[PDB]
């Protein structure tokens, strides 16, 4: 049917925008951990005159670096925010297809699943699960960059750094809701 194949894309773009995601979220790392290294050999600064005046200079460049660095890592940011609101988009796109077959076709009660099992409405339980998990997950990383930026301990930085790549929220269940809607809609 025509929803069964809009439900099928719409896992598809789901697949798509959390491989986005992630691609972002490891590029972002990569920075953050740039500007964590970056922190600590700036934070370690009666040795000699010649190292004095080198630690000095070095030093100077290190704050440029730092300043670039974070700037780099708010893009990211954007990214991902950008991200966060084609995902919304799929989210009310299920929702609306629910809407289109009840109109339809009537009480969901009364009619076949569109593929194996799952009434069309558990696609858009699922689908709000993944946008609820993301908006947390981008509230987070805006907290946890400005902490990068600004914390002056080093183990702090590690555990700031740490939060990022996990991603406490999105490494629940992320994988698990949307490996079950590829499962039921035939996607490899």
């Not at 490891?26 to 290294?37: E, K, P």
């Not at 005159?49 to 200079?57: D, L, R, T």
């Not at 700037?71 to 629910?98: H, P, R, Y």
């Amino acid at each position: 049917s025509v929803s069964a194949r809009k439900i099928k894309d719409n896992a598809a773009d789901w697949h798509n925008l959390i491989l986005k995601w992630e691609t972002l979220n490891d590029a972002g790392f990569t920075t953050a951990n740039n500007i964590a290294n970056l922190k600590i050999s700036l934070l370690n600064k009666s040795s000699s005159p010649a190292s004095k005046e080198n630690e000095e200079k070095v030093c100077l460049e290190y704050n440029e670096e730092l300043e670039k660095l974070c700037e780099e890592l708010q893009a990211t940011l954007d990214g991902l925010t950008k991200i966060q609101v084609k995902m919304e988009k799929l989210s009310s796109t299920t929702k609306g297809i629910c809407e289109l077959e009840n109109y339809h076709y009537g009480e969901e009660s009364k009619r076949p699943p569109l593929f194996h099992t799952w009434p069309t409405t558990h696609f858009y339980e699922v689908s709000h699960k993944l946008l609820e998990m993301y908006r947390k997950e981008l509230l987070l990383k805006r907290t946890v960059a400005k902490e990068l930026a600004h914390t002056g301990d080093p183990d702090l930085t590690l555990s700031y750094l740490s939060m990022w790549l996990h991603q406490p929220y999105v490494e629940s269940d992320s994988r698990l809701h949307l490996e079950s809607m590829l499962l039921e809609t035939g996607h490899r």
